[PDB]
Amino acid sequence: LQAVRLYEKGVILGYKRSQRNQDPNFTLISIKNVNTKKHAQFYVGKRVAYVYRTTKHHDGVKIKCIWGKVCRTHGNSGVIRAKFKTHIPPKAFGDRVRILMYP
Amino acid sequence: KQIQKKELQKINHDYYKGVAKAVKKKKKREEKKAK
Amino acid sequence: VELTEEEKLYISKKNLLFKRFVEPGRLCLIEYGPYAGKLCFIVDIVTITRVIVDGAFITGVPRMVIPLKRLKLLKERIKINKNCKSGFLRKTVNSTKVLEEFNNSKLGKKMIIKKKRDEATDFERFQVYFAKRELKKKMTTIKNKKN
Amino acid sequence: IDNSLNTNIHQYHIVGRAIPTAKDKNPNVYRMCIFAKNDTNAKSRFWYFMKKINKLKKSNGELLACEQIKERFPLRVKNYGVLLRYDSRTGTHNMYKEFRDTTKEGAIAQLYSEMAGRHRARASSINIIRISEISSSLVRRPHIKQLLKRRLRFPALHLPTLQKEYRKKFASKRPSTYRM
Amino acid sequence: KTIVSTQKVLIPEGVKVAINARKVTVSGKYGTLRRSFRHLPIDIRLNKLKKYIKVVMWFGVPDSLACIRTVCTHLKNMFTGVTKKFLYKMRLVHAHFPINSNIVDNNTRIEIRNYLGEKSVRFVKALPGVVIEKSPNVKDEIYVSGADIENVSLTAALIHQSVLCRNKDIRKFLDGIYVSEVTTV
Amino acid sequence: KATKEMLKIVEPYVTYGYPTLSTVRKLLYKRGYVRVGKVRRYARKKIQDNADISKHLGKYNVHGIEDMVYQLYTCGPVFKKVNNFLWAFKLKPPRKGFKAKRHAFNEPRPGDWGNREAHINELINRMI
Amino acid sequence: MYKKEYVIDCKGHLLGRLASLIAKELLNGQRIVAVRCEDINISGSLYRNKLKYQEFLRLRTNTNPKKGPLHLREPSKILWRCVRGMLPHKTYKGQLALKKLKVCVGMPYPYDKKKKYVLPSALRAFRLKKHRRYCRLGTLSSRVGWNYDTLVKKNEVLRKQVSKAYYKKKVNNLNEKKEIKTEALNLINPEQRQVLENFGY
RNA sequence: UUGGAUAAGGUGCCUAAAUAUUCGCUCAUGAGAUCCCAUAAAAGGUGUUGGUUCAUAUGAACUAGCCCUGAAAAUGGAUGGCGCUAAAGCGGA
RNA sequence: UUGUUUUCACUUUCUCCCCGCACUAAUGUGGGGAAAACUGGCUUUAUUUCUUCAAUUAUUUUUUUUGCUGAGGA
């Protein structure tokens, strides 16, 4: 009906990480229908929006977005690394991101 | 390059034949020492 | 020495549990690796786990060794010789039109329509949406006339 | 070509010879076929056997030739009998094993996998002597004998090995191992 | 690992056989037997008009191949038990104390007394499709008969083992009920 | 003989091989740094120009990175001077990784150390 | 992973593989509901797994068994404990992941009327060679002290009968819809019919 | 500090990465599972898998892989845990 | 005390014949023989966009989509 989406859904997994060590400059993101490195390479360079709600208004709006970008793939199973303007908080692990169709 | 191919075939054939003759000599020696 | 009339029905109704053997000339579909999704023919068997599959110069699979676990055997099989080569395999494939009769079975049509559906452009995706919309309009009309 | 499928064993023909000294004007030259991952390893093996069999070490020797042997018909399956010498944890044993495939190097790779699997024999414990193509009438191992029937056919009881893309986590109905 | 190995069993005359996904039903004039072989990887072919059953195994290792003959013998046992009932003849031997056998509930539930003069009743219940009766010719005999060899032989074993001797020399105190012979009717 | 015997005692901790011309050229062109300054005050500088090559090695007519490449590839009359003038290459880790630095390249198992012969070229290319 | 909730029919799955897949899904944030937990399979014989559970039962804090490892005998709880062992349950995020999981024996009222999914990489039929032994979790639980196996079985047969009635109605409706569609396919314009025929509709 | 790529070591979950590919072996009613490292022997097995040498497809005798016995301790307990057997074990690639 | 030379033994059949003559895993089969020559192998000519032109190495030249960075101020 209304509110076209034209973006691919993704989920914020943890940070770029080893066992017992974190690199919260990158975020691991899982994209909806991608399960392979070759397919994940497709959405490289696309902008990513972490859109989330907030208890009280900040510009007359209850919603704000953390902007980032897909930088490269991660592993073999279509997980990507995203670099955001600011490190997304670990409270957002498991939340939804938009892999936008632009650029 | 037909002549080069023929010469090449001949050298590889000689190498394979030498290997096979080693096979036969070792088998003959083993059969000698069986008895 | 012959079988009269018992054979022509009993052999046919035998209904073996295992059809689709790994004989030469069995038409199989590759499902793993760089040639996944392409058809090929088993030309002969090297070990229990290894076979030689040759897609005649049609299917795009070269003559090569593949492990048998990477194959999915299909219903079709041609009568190629034990040691036949690529040229005679192509001749026999064309003569038998086995590939045509594969692109008629339920799997072959499914593969064909899936290929063209994933090849569809944005305009023809909309054309499908529009056509299904019209079909739904008509379906509702006759469903209500049914009542 | 599928690199997931290829192994990295090749056959090399290596010819070497001791450096001519004032004692002997020209030593006899030796030639050998060695299966190895690359020509460097093949030459290392060649000098190992030179030193072990003859009293000739790499420092007193020189390499006259080293070239890779390519199988004539890499798409024709043949039966290979390979003689073998390997030392187990408590002794040394020579055995004879049989394979069938398209290339001698492929047969040797099968041999290495099988010796490791069956006898825990590492490649450093194996010496390959005498791999050679054999005739069907002289095949001796039953697991190869049963592969040479007039018409050979069997079902395809292997489980399907799909691509990663279609190896989906949640299925809508239980698949069939019968498939066929 | 052998590529294919098969064994063939002949179907006797008055037997009807139905095999579906290695579940076997054998019907004959002495009743119907059932047996599921779904614990074995077996390709079972039943030829109905030309009789015979062939069990085939593809890619069998010796451990699994040992079961082909087992299945074939089980099938032939079903055939014979359905054509002519299996019969285990048992003798109750005793030294000084005679063994009193009483058969009740329609030739099941045999109860014995006076085992070593114990004046305590030991009873065994026959397995399904099994009847226990006294022989009409020789007195210390017992007939355990039925269509299923497993059930019949197990009933004979139960009768034998319900009457074992305790805290004595077993090789001198020999009294008990023992399977004298195996046959059919 | 002298350098081979020196290399023998260090063999388990290095891997070496015969470079070939294209890899020599790639090494000098993209990872070639040079010791520029006074003697014992060298100040590593990327080549970027033939001026410093001319200044230090010109008296042996080695004006130019192509002269450097030639003398290195063909062990020519001026090799010690060119090699010493050239700062030690600082290579990246290999693109696909090693196999096992613990074991010899000539061991039947995967390994890396020892003389790789011509196989040094692909490793250098991954490390460059 | 991207659904609001995934209902998994645990019948015929292997316990450890099922638990691993469920654990990863929960940590990634997917709510899953596991039904028919009494039909989970474990590789290895029933006696061997019973010995394993006896070893587990012999385990308790000897100063106060109330504090000890609570053993739990319902097969649903056994699955839940396995998933928790595959999980970082002592962190806040791990606890959230654990509490995103619901386990049932049988198929209760909401979940009997929703689509049940299956994990191919955890079916016994795909992960165990046929000639090897396995056990049924409900049977193990009954031998260990659950004594609700038969009740769940009869509830399941009643549910299956209801489901069969539903399926018959659904099949009839599908046939009716198919007939209406095939009649309507001749009433649309030939361009629309041609597009649908070309793309397989 | 920002990117990149690796080492050692890993890639079923805990835990970032393979329920990867390919070939064998193993069923354990106390399986096994990363140098140091967190014990196991003599002696056995008609378990199974390959080899060797004698006997007109048979019988033996050896050999060595994995498995089993030998193998008993005190709070309740530890391949790190869960668990894993078409391995997530063992030997390779 | 090396070469060189020679013998048979090596193939497909959806062929024929015999025996079991329906016995097979089989829409066939086991055992024993005959056959040419489709299949397979070799030689001559023309062609390589019907089809093939591979793999490795040496030596070169490009290309798709993209991440991070912008010191300095002559």
Percent helix of chain F, as a range, is: 25-40%
The largest β sheet of chain B comes out as: none
Instruction: Please indicate the percent range of residues of chain B in DSSP E strands (runs of 2 or more).
Output: under 5%
Tally the helices of chain F: 6
Radius of gyration of chain F: 16 Å
Q: Count of DSSP helices of chain B?
A: 1
**Strands of chain F, total number:** 4
Q: Give me the count of strands of chain B.
A: 0
Greatest interface (CB-CB under 8 A), with counts per chain: C-D, 31 and 23 residues
Tell the overall outline of chain F.
elongated
Structural category of chain F is: mainly alpha
From the spread of the alpha carbons, the general shape of chain B counts as rod-shaped
Distance between the termini of chain F: 29 Å
Q: Taking Cα atoms only, what radius of gyration of chain B do you get, to the nearest Å?
A: 15 Å
Strand line-up of the largest beta sheet of chain F: 1-4
Structural class of chain B: mainly alpha
Q: Please state the oligomeric state of the protein chains shown.
A: part of a larger assembly
The fraction of residues in strands of chain F falls at 5-15%
Largest sheet of chain F: 2 strands, parallel
Write the H/E string of chain F, N to C. Answer: HEHEEHHHEH
Organism (chain G): Plasmodium falciparum (isolate 3D7)
Protein name (chain G): 60S ribosomal protein L13, putative
Pfam families (chain G): Ribosomal_L13 (PF00572)
Family (chain G): Belongs to the universal ribosomal protein uL13 family.
Topology:
The structure is cut from a larger assembly and holds 7 protein chains of 7 kinds.
Chain E: E1 2-9, E2 16-19, E3 23-28, E4 31-36, E5 43-46, E6 53-60, H1 62-83, E7 86-93, E8 100-104, E9 108-113, E10 122-124, E11 130-134, E12 141-146, H2 149-161, E13 176-184
Antiparallel strand pairs in E: 1-6, 2-3, 3-4, 5-6, 7-12, 7-13, 8-9, 9-10, 11-12
Chain F: H1 2-10, E1 15-17, H2 21-31, E2 33-34, E3 45-46, H3 51-57, H4 65-73, H5 80-85, E4 114-117, H6 120-127
Parallel strand pairs in F: 1-4
Antiparallel strand pairs in F: 2-3
Helix pairs in contact in F: 2-4
Chain G: E1 6-9, H1 15-28, E2 32-35, E3 41-43, H2 46-57, H3 75-85, H4 92-99, E4 101-103, H5 124-127, E5 134-136, H6 137-144, H7 149-184, H8 190-199
Parallel strand pairs in G: 1-2, 2-4
Antiparallel strand pairs in G: 3-5
Helix pairs in contact in G: 1-3, 1-4, 2-6
The structure holds 2 RNA strands.
Protein name (chain F): 60S ribosomal protein L7, putative
Family (chain F): Belongs to the universal ribosomal protein uL30 family.
GO molecular function, one term (chain A): structural constituent of ribosome
